[PDB]
Design an enzyme around this catalytic site. Structure first.
Site, PDB file in Angstrom:
ATOM      1  N   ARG A 347      -2.261  10.007   1.138  1.00 60.07           N
ATOM      2  CA  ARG A 347      -1.124   9.690   0.278  1.00 60.07           C
ATOM      3  C   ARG A 347       0.169  10.454   0.632  1.00 60.07           C
ATOM      4  O   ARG A 347       1.096  10.550  -0.182  1.00 60.07           O
ATOM      5  CB  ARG A 347      -1.485   9.899  -1.201  1.00 60.07           C
ATOM      6  CG  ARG A 347      -2.744   9.178  -1.648  1.00 60.07           C
ATOM      7  CD  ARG A 347      -2.703   8.879  -3.143  1.00 60.07           C
ATOM      8  NE  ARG A 347      -4.036   8.711  -3.736  1.00 60.07           N
ATOM      9  CZ  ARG A 347      -4.271   8.149  -4.924  1.00 60.07           C
ATOM     10  NH1 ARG A 347      -3.273   7.677  -5.662  1.00 60.07           N
ATOM     11  NH2 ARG A 347      -5.508   8.045  -5.383  1.00 60.07           N
TER      12      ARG A 347
HETATM   13  N1  LIG Z   1       4.127  -0.601  -1.301  1.00 56.89           N
HETATM   14  C1  LIG Z   1       3.144  -0.169  -0.335  1.00 56.89           C
HETATM   15  N2  LIG Z   1       3.239  -0.560   0.987  1.00 56.89           N
HETATM   16  C2  LIG Z   1       2.278  -0.118   1.890  1.00 56.89           C
HETATM   17  N3  LIG Z   1       1.271   0.678   1.476  1.00 56.89           N
HETATM   18  C3  LIG Z   1       1.175   1.079   0.118  1.00 56.89           C
HETATM   19  C4  LIG Z   1       2.124   0.642  -0.759  1.00 56.89           C
HETATM   20  N4  LIG Z   1       1.834   1.148  -1.997  1.00 56.89           N
HETATM   21  C5  LIG Z   1       0.747   1.885  -1.883  1.00 56.89           C
HETATM   22  N5  LIG Z   1       0.319   1.848  -0.549  1.00 56.89           N
HETATM   23  C6  LIG Z   1      -0.843   2.565  -0.041  1.00 56.89           C
HETATM   24  O1  LIG Z   1      -1.692   2.864  -1.132  1.00 56.89           O
HETATM   25  C7  LIG Z   1      -1.827   4.287  -1.305  1.00 56.89           C
HETATM   26  C8  LIG Z   1      -1.966   4.829  -2.708  1.00 56.89           C
HETATM   27  O2  LIG Z   1      -0.894   4.488  -3.516  1.00 56.89           O
HETATM   28  P1  LIG Z   1      -0.944   4.850  -5.115  1.00 56.89           P
HETATM   29  O3  LIG Z   1       0.188   3.896  -5.825  1.00 56.89           O
HETATM   30  O4  LIG Z   1      -0.609   6.257  -5.325  1.00 56.89           O
HETATM   31  O5  LIG Z   1      -2.412   4.534  -5.789  1.00 56.89           O
HETATM   32  P2  LIG Z   1      -2.606   4.690  -7.420  1.00 56.89           P
HETATM   33  O6  LIG Z   1      -2.618   3.291  -7.788  1.00 56.89           O
HETATM   34  O7  LIG Z   1      -4.025   5.403  -7.881  1.00 56.89           O
HETATM   35  O8  LIG Z   1      -1.444   5.590  -8.177  1.00 56.89           O
HETATM   36  C9  LIG Z   1      -0.614   4.852  -0.565  1.00 56.89           C
HETATM   37  O9  LIG Z   1      -0.628   6.214  -0.285  1.00 56.89           O
HETATM   38  C10 LIG Z   1      -0.430   3.876   0.578  1.00 56.89           C
HETATM   39  O10 LIG Z   1      -0.921   4.261   1.830  1.00 56.89           O
HETATM   40 MG   LIG Z   2      -0.900   7.540  -8.959  1.00 55.77          MG
END
Ligand SMILES: Nc1ncnc2c1ncn2[C@@H]1O[C@H](COP(=O)(O)OP(=O)(O)O)[C@@H](O)[C@H]1O
Ligand SMILES: [Mg+2]
Ligand SMILES: Nc1ncnc2c1ncn2[C@@H]1O[C@H](COP(=O)(O)OP(=O)(O)NP(=O)(O)O)[C@@H](O)[C@H]1O
Ligand SMILES: Nc1ncnc2c1ncn2[C@@H]1O[C@H](COP(=O)(O)OP(=O)(O)NP(=O)(O)O)[C@@H](O)[C@H]1O
Ligand SMILES: [Mg+2]
Ligand SMILES: [Mg+2]
Lengths: 484, 66, 51, 167, 467, 466
Positions: A347
């Site tokens: 992340r």
């Molecule tokens: N808009 C995006 N474009 C490309 N990859 C994404 C995108 N959003 C999330 N990811 C991938 O998904 C991972 C986790 O995102 P995250 O939103 O933090 O999960 P969560 O839903 O538990 O908060 C990222 O670190 C990334 O590699």
């Molecule tokens: Mg989160």
């Protein structure tokens, strides 16, 4: 100064007295045994004994310490091996523990910190390119037993030699290694492994094992944290590895159940999330105004048959800043270290690489999650257009790249070397069954010849059109010299 | 801190009449010897069973093959 | 080897040696009725200090 | 509703709950002492060779056990506003419990009066005073007048220690 | 009055009161701490004793410690002087900038906007994220929910949301991180100061921050969301304003509730949540609403425990929404971020009489073809592709295009993607798909729709990938 | 002193001592029966009462009945005057050969070998069992685990090991039968007298027997695992000797725990087990170890309930081993004995630096083709062999041979296999596979490799068919 024992059994002593005892304050026992308050109830203090409760008997005497629980800290610990309370157990006589930090410290709030920018290298091609860690990050290693979960964390400390035996005071990384639940036969065999490769010197190793009491495994990874909190709160760089949180949780469950705290899912107690949440938050990237110091944390989780729905494995994944999955399937299939790219995430992305890696592998993580799916769709022997004929014609070779030996990290420079070989398409015409005898040569050939190029990329951590240009020939100067 | 610095002296008016009373480990009884033989076997184990006072001769062996 | 045949020897002896202390001091208080006077002594020097 | 005289001994939390009542039921009419002795007596009106065939007898029940306790109240030195802590334990089926309810009546009485710290080797200092460890000395004057890792652990091991002068 | 701690386990402290038994909900005060400790009252066990949740850790307390009946429910720095400021569970500021300065305070335990105050007006809030706008547009001033298992892009989405929607917005925004990552708060503070929705200098701050992360107790997490919404409830009722309230992660509210529930005396219910998971959510979602007096666009993100959308937590959350974007691991795993399930995502205003027959008819057409492709999916991949109809290799072809054109390089995700951000205006989305659907690009190869913005930018990659 | 039974339930009894009170772990002694009824304190309930786990039937006990403190743990005979004798959980002898006159005693409980005492000595122990040697070799003085569900052949395999190992072995062996078949004991005894590891005539006996089988109370099954433990412990320490510890079945130890944890009054944990499954185990388990002083090569058969390899019992135990052999009903049902799962059995010494990267290479090469076969396993089941690509048609055939050449007719079940009991040396193990892998044999029928010794008997077989 303190009072009676009402009843004792299973590491749980009820106590009629201690009327002014702090909750979470450690008491001491008749026989000289350090305990701990956890249930402050009307008519008694339930106390979790920190050792064999045979010595305890009804009626014994429990005396306050006044203190919330704490442990030895500081460089006076490096190279040692201490139990969960700081005590040395490698038979080398006490540590020089002037510094004494509390275990029960809460984690750094919002301000004391700054975006994780500092590359924490593992020396593992697989990790350092596709799921790169950075100082202050929590990256979870999760997987079935005997998948390689540990030979990750070990290969990483053994990588920190390079930086700790040098000058640059930022690239230096002191290592703690909690060992919860394991067997001494192993903790040892492991220290021996560290020692041999010569890494034991920069490495605390707190060890609360199988035979150690229950609250001692509960506490161990916290203790080992405080010790790493110092290194960050005093402007230095720590990497603590809890191995593993799975076994710890189990321990916390025992205490909790024996304490008569009504059980929840899979018998664990309610706060079994809070447990790993709070511990794991305490790793941060402190902002300059606070030291610049860090605490990267690799927690480790062990799954059953792959079940990542299990109470715990789902909790810890929700907590850490990403994770590496392991998978026995890939392992035997040849993909050692067995990783599962597509399912491993970091992340923090490139924000934690050199601009040297980034240039060879910054959109190749979303490529080996599409070349993946685009060789699982056209698995069968038919026809596919001009676009998707190549992606496969590449990947097979690329994977043969992250195939890596054990106990043999690589310095980022060399990683960029081989990754370059393929990614720029200087392998796009070679039979995969050789792509290893190849690398094992083209990398000892460009260490014996050009300490030159490595010098630059290693230092400025980037590939200027300069550096790039040299490569563009050193490579070519090899494919034609073998096949063609 | 003033009625305790001399009770720690009831401990070398004896430490005295011991690290001077020669004639054998004091008042032993049988126990003393037996145990000092069991730990004389196991400590004679990790090493070998040959002569510990002499310099060992040397039998040598050829190089095997896989 | 002798690094050890002398190791168990200086310790074990010094076990019986410091332990021998015990049984000669349990003989000093249990006996010596004049080691029941040095009882009320040092102990009444407790109540005081604390306060 | 009523407010409650919780006297700084408190005691329980779950069971001798009747006790914690009468330091508040009594402290209205200041008849604390009228009962401090009343109970002492009932504690043995029941330990008779004539009262155990009901004391622990789920045979008679809340019928002829409460109105056969209008006797061991009205009759004897009782019949006040404390013939009732019985008439409760009588109904609330906990006559089998009163001994413990009297026990605690005390340990809560003698914390409005005495203090309870004890000597080492014999009896109770009863330091009935406004200050703790004030009269702990001047009342024990009527008592006259009536270092190598291991040796460390083995010296504190006799001082204030073990099975010795304990007997 | 004054009260004395009687007992303490983990996060639940019972207290006894000589006289002044505090009403449930009443915030109590622990006398003697090096940092303030509040105890929200939770029940009357009787005998002048009250069980309570701590809004911080009970390490240290002692049987008899002094507690004071603060006389009324937790109260916070509601008001305009909260902008740019990082508040917390109990009001106390924690960006280190000395007391938040206002003389208006509100309890975080309110009742809920009665029936008659309900607004029935709904109009399409465009987000420029193609997938949401095409298939499940959000509505100005409505409850939106972001469903997601761990790591599927829930949080990133809500960033690119606060980037787009909350920047071109001249009203007030309130982002409240309940129970998630402290790293990610620090992370946003600074992005939101680089953009300067928070400005440290002037008073042009458009964003109140409330925070209570996965490092704090169950007490905290259970109420952090009650606070951040009290904050945004003011900016609504007063201003008549357009308040943007973001939460991340409204899940941690029920989980937090879970952790203490045990110690509070609850037989557990199904999946082992509180027997109250239901109403706990109700008397709290029913506040994050839009009255006649004001409007609150709400964007919650919900964790789906283990991806099981039926887990009583995310399950019960669905009732409380007007538009739900549901995130799919299987989609993300294919590289198609934002991993929105075009067949589990839903809006209330996807009505032809609201978005027009062109929009509607076009969304539903995409939804259909993707569904049909899903249907051929285990014929083909195990029994020979070219064994398909002519009609079907066609509805596969187009589908996979449509399916990829649905991805978007997010501006807050350049760090991951590798392409410069993007953003498509509603009518170029409708048009883009309408075309692909119509058979106008059956010649351009797949990857050309993968991760571009407006439809033309795919015709771009259409030659760039060519020669 | 003296106290009284005030509560009895199952193997849990509650004694009241007015004077004094026994440390937790003190063997008590019931006074009033024709049968030594040891209790073992495990809790102080307060009100000067303790809670104890019986070590035998409790029919008869009464509220009343006196109990004497023994002032010590349960203590048993140890030393060389045990070799050849069968003793029960409290040391009593049960081979009806008088008493076991012995110098010293030990208690069944005992703290475990401190970290400094550990030894990293890793040397391979060849079994002459093809799968074990080639893929996950046992290590001298290592902990070994045999996992299996009801009937997959743990006991046979432990026996074959006892034969290919403890017959030509200068050194003491201890066999603890924990809660398994009483008739298996009678069987061992006789089998070891004939073969003469036990000798009734002499003191030339090389083995000690500790037995507490599936007919005895929880308490007894609970503990006996430790009796036999203590014995092996001595032979290691006060003899700095080479000890062989065989247990069958270590599972019954945790199980028995479970049976008592209920009435001891703990709150139930996952799947109903005792709250204390990990440490209850881990204490006991970590005593079974090779230290600097002596050296124990342990081999424990581990039962798996309902074939659930995730059941806490088997699940937890894995932590404690250096080499594991896992048996699958699935395999056994295809007549592939010994029923070893090649992709689930592991050793912490399959490592080129330890086994020499010809071994490590033929291993992971078998382990690969197998796990490649296993992936096709699904398409072959739905569409059939034919839909298999040409390359893949092979990967099967070769793999299927490997699958078959890991079968090996044991010198025990000469009775079930009928076939003559083979034992294959590391060399010809490593060799044969290498050949099979390099496809020298793609010309031989499958069967040719099923149930044989070295690769000769394979190619040899192939002829007798033709
Ligand atoms: N808009 C995006 N474009 C490309 N990859 C994404 C995108 N959003 C999330 N990811 C991938 O998904 C991972 C986790 O995102 P995250 O939103 O933090 O999960 P969560 O839903 O538990 O908060 C990222 O670190 C990334 O590699
Ligand atoms: Mg989160
Ligand atoms: N990159 C590699 N290449 C070849 N073998 C490897 C590699 N990494 C690990 N191994 C081997 O695989 C085994 C398991 O590694 P390990 O780190 O213990 O995984 P694990 O899941 O932590 N095992 P455990 O602690 O029982 O859960 C070892 O004994 C290694 O020698
Ligand atoms: N190694 C073997 N080779 C050939 N046949 C075998 C083998 N092992 C077991 N069998 C057959 O299957 C049965 C089971 O053997 P056994 O070793 O007793 O299984 P187990 O692990 O002990 N299960 P259990 O003893 O009931 O807890 C035998 O009695 C044989 O008929
Ligand atoms: Mg590991
Ligand atoms: Mg068996």
């Amino acid at each position: 100064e303190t009072g009676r024992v009402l009843s004792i059994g299973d590491g749980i002593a009820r106590v009629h007295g201690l009327r002014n005892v702090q909750a979470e304050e450690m008491v001491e026992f008749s026989s000289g045994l350090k305990g701990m308050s956890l249930n402050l109830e009307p008519d008694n203090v339930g106390v979790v004994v920190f050792g064999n409760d045979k010595l305890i008997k009804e009626g014994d005497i429990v005396k306050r310490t006044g203190a919330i629980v704490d442990v030895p800290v500081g460089e006076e610990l490096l190279g040692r091996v201490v139990d969960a309370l700081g005590n040395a157990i490698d038979g080398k006589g006490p540590i020089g523990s002037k510094a004494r930090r509390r275990v029960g410290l809460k984690a750094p709030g919002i301000i004391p910190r700054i975006s994780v920018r500092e590359p924490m290298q593992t020396g593992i091609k697989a990790v350092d390119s596709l799921v790169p860690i950075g100082r202050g990050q929590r990256e979870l290693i999760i997987g079935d037993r005997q998948t390689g979960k540990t030979s990750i964390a070990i290969d990483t400390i053994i990588n920190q030699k390079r930086f700790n035996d040098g000058t640059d005071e930022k690239k230096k990384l002191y290592c703690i290694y909690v060992a919860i639940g394991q067997k001494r036969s192993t903790v040892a065999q492991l220290v021996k492994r560290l020692t041999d490769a010569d890494a034991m010197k920069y490495t605390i190793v707190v060890s609360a094992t199988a035979s150690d009491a229950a609250p001692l495994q509960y506490l161990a990874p916290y203790s080992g944290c405080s010790m790493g909190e110092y290194f960050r709160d005093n402007g230095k760089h720590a990497l603590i590895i809890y191995d593993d949180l799975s076994k710890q949780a189990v321990a916390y469950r025992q205490m909790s159940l024996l304490l008569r705290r009504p059980p929840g899912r899979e018998a664990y107690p309610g706060d079994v999330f809070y447990l790993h949440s709070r511990l794991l938050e305490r790793a941060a990237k402190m902002n300059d105004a606070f030291g610049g110091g860090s605490l990267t944390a690799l927690p480790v989780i062990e799954t059953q048959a792959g079940d990542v729905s299990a109470y715990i494995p789902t909790n810890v994944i929700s907590i850490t800043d990403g994770q590496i999955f392991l998978e026995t399937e890939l392992f035997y299939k040849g993909i050692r270290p067995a990783i599962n790219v597509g399912l491993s995430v970091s992340r923090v992305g490139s924000a934690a690489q050199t601009r040297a890696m980034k240039q060879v592998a910054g959109t190749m993580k979303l490529e080996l999650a599409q070349y993946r799916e685009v060789a699982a769709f056209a698995q069968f022997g038919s026809d596919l257009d001009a676009a998707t004929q190549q992606l496969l014609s590449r990947g097979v070779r690329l994977t043969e790249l992250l195939k890596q030996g054990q106990y043999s990290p690589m310095a980022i420079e060399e990683q960029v070397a081989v990754i370059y070989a393929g990614v720029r398409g200087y392998l796009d015409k070679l039979e995969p069954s050789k792509i290893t005898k190849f690398e094992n040569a083209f990398l000892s050939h460009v260490i014996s010849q050009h300490q030159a190029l490595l010098g630059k990329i290693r230092t400025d951590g980037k590939i200027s059109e300069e550096s790039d240009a040299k490569l563009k020939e050193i490579v070519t100067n090899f494919l034609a010299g073998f096949e063609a | 801190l003033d009625p305790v610095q001399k009770l720690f002296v009831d401990k070398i008016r004896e430490y005295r009449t011991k690290r001077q009373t020669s004639g054998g480990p004091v008042d032993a009884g049988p126990e003393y010897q037996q145990d000092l033989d069991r730990e004389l076997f196991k400590l004679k184990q990790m090493y070998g069973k040959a002569d510990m006072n002499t310099f060992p001769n040397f039998t040598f062996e050829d190089p095997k093959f896989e | 080897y002798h690094i050890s045949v002398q190791n168990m020897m200086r310790q074990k002896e010094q076990e019986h040696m410091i332990n021998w202390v015990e049984k000669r001091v349990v003989q000093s208080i249990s006996a010596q009725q004049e080691k029941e006077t040095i009882a009320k002594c040092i102990a009444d020097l407790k109540l005081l200090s604390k306060k | 509703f009523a407010k409650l005289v919780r006297p700084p001994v408190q005691i329980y939390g779950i069971e001798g709950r009747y006790a914690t009542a009468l330091y508040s039921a009594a402290s209205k009419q200041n008849k604390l002492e009228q009962v401090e002795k009343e109970l002492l007596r009932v504690g043995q009106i029941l330990k008779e060779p004539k009262m155990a065939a009901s004391l622990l007898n789920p045979y008679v029940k809340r019928s002829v056990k409460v109105k056969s306790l209008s006797d061991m109240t009205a009759k004897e030195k009782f019949s006040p506003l404390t013939s009732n802590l019985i008439n409760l334990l009588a109904e609330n089926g906990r006559l089998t419990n009163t001994p413990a309810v009297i026990s605690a009546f005390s340990t809560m009485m003698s914390v409005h009066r005495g203090e309870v710290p004890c000597t080492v080797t014999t009896a109770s200092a009863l330091d009935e005073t406004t200050l703790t460890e004030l009269k702990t000395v001047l009342k024990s004057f009527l008592s006259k007048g009536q270092k190598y890792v291991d040796m460390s652990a083995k010296t504190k091991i006799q001082k204030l220690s073990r099975a010795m002068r304990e007997i | 009055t004054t009260g004395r701690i009687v007992a303490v386990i983990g996060a639940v402290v019972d207290v006894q009161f000589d006289e002044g038994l505090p009403p449930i909900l009443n915030a109590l005060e622990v006398q003697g701490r090096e940092t303030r400790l509040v105890l929200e009252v939770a029940q009357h066990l009787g005998e002048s004793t009250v069980r309570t949740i701590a809004m911080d850790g009970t390490e240290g307390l002692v049987r008899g410690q002094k507690v004071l009946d603060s006389g009324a429910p937790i109260r916070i720095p509601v008001g305009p002087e909260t902008l740019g400021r990082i508040m917390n569970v109990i009001g106390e500021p924690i960006d280190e900038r000395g007391p938040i300065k206002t003389k208006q305070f509100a309890a975080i335990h309110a009742e809920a906007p009665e029936f008659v105050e309900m607004s029935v007006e709904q109009e399409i809030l465009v987000t420029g994220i193609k997938v949401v706008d095409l298939l499940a547009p959000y509505a100005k001033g409505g409850k939106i929910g972001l469903f997601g298992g761990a790591g599927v892009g829930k949080t990133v989405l809500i960033m690119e949301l606060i980037n787009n929607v909350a920047k071109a917005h001249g009203g007030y925004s309130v982002f409240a991180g309940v129970g998630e990552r402290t790293r990610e708060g620090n992370d946003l503070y600074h992005e939101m100061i680089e953009s300067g929705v928070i400005n440290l200098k002037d008073a042009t701050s458009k964003v109140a921050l409330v925070y209570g992360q996965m490092n704090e107790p169950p007490g905290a997490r259970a109420r952090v969301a009650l606070t951040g919404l009290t904050v945004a409830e003011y900016f609504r009722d007063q201003e008549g304003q357009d308040v943007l309230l973001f939460i991340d992660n409204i899940f941690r509210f029920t989980q937090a509730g879970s952790e203490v529930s045990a110690l509070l005396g609850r037989i557990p219910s199904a999946v082992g949540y509180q027997p109250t998971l239901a109403t706990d959510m109700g008397t709290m979602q029913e506040r994050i609403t839009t009255t006649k007096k004001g409007s609150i666009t709400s964007v919650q993100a919900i964790y789906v425990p283990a991806d099981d959308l039926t887990d009583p937590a995310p399950a019960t959350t669905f009732a409380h929404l007007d538009a739900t974007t549901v995130l799919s691991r299987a989609i993300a795993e294919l590289g198609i971020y934002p991993a929105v399930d075009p067949l589990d995502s839903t809006s209330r205003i996807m009505d032809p009489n609201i978005v027009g027959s062109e929009h509607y008819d076009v969304a539903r057409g995409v939804q259909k073809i993707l569904q049909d492709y899903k249907s051929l999916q285990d014929i083909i991949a195990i029994l020979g592709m070219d064994e398909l109809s002519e009609e079907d290799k066609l509805t596969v072809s187009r589908a996979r295009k449509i399916q990829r054109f649905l991805s978007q390089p997010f501006q807050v995700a350049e760090v991951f993607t590798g392409h410069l951000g993007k953003l498509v205006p509603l009518k170029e989305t409708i048009k883009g798909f309408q075309q692909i659907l119509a058979g106008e690009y059956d010649h351009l190869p797949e990857q050309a729709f993968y991760m571009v913005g407006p439809i033309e930018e795919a015709v771009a990659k259409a030659d760039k990938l060519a020669e």
